[PDB]
Enzyme design. Sequence first.
Site, PDB file in Angstrom:
ATOM      1  N   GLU A 181      -6.336  -0.359   4.672  1.00  0.00           N
ATOM      2  CA  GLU A 181      -6.003   1.061   4.778  1.00  0.00           C
ATOM      3  C   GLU A 181      -5.060   1.300   5.952  1.00  0.00           C
ATOM      4  OE1 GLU A 181      -9.414   3.540   5.143  1.00  0.00           O
ATOM      5  OE2 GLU A 181      -9.558   3.950   2.991  1.00  0.00           O
ATOM      6  N   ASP A 224     -14.024  10.029   3.901  1.00  0.00           N
ATOM      7  CA  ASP A 224     -13.040   9.738   2.842  1.00  0.00           C
ATOM      8  C   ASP A 224     -12.440  11.021   2.285  1.00  0.00           C
ATOM      9  OD1 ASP A 224     -14.035   7.103   3.093  1.00  0.00           O
ATOM     10  OD2 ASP A 224     -13.870   6.733   0.947  1.00  0.00           O
TER      11      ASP A 224
END
Length: 376
Positions: free
Chosen positions: A65, A258
């Site tokens: 990420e 998230d």
Amino acid sequence: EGAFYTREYRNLFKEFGYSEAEIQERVKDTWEQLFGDNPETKIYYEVGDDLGYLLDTGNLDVRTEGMSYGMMMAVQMDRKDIFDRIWNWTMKNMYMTEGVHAGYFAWSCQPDGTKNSWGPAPDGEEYFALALFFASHRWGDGDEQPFNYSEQARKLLHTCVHNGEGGPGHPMWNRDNKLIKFIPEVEFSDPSFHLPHFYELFSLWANEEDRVFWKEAAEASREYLKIACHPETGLAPEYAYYDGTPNDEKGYGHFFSDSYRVAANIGLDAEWFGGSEWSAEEINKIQAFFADKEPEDYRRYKIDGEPFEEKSLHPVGLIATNAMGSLASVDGPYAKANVDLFWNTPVRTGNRRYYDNCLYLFAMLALSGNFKIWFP
Ligand code: NI
């Protein structure tokens, strides 16, 4: 009509009354606080003459990420030197040649390069692919691998769609419903991973045999977000089943880390590909939910808005994403308030800063008209 068509990017800070000079300064300062020698705020670390990584400061590891985010940030900032350092480290230490996930990138490595897992994180892959396309378009494909950017992007997206057709692997999209998966071996998703605006571009630049697929994935993701976001609060769960409802089997069924990216994604899609009634209404809902809440008091919430005792672990990231969402509702009742709140929030210091600061720089880029599509 979106920036994809007009080739003009909204500078929402400027439209909300911030001066061009102060915006320029703030964008550069945000970059320098993350990528320069500012130890308290920094997330990027250089190694030797040809390597570099972004450190997850909380977990003391290097994540796909973060590496994919760093490449996207670097190409937006026209910093090929940094882009290549990060991509080189990624290919050297994270790319998998062995095991069931060969062809994907190990999601977490130690700073020394050692893999902590041989499982990938699909939201890394999709950012790598678009960042690589943008690198190819800004700088041209490099003569030596792995700097042949466009080839690397098309190859990776080939794996994402077709893996398992000639091996034990699995694709990162479900081929029937065209939805990105949480990980290749499960059959559920994560709303924050859905980037229809990225898939539109993949429908132009991926291998031709997959271009129709990518158009279908863009549409499927847009529809999925409608069912995944709570109809009153606008809040999306971290993980969700394909049916749109939260997957709380392991505690990821709520509005938490998230989820924050959903508002940001909706903002950027609106800017690139055009506004929509649904998107404006969705951002209005999220912003309405937070309108009477103090950042120091931000919690984990059930998607219906019920608060937990637990505080948000990344409230600065939440602020940044909510402000970036304003790109989808520029005339919204809380749009200016959110942009101002973000302006008045410093880059995060301390151990949990990595995630907040990534979301922060993306919002700084997008809100200033500097998160662009780089065309061939
Ligand atoms: Ni100034």
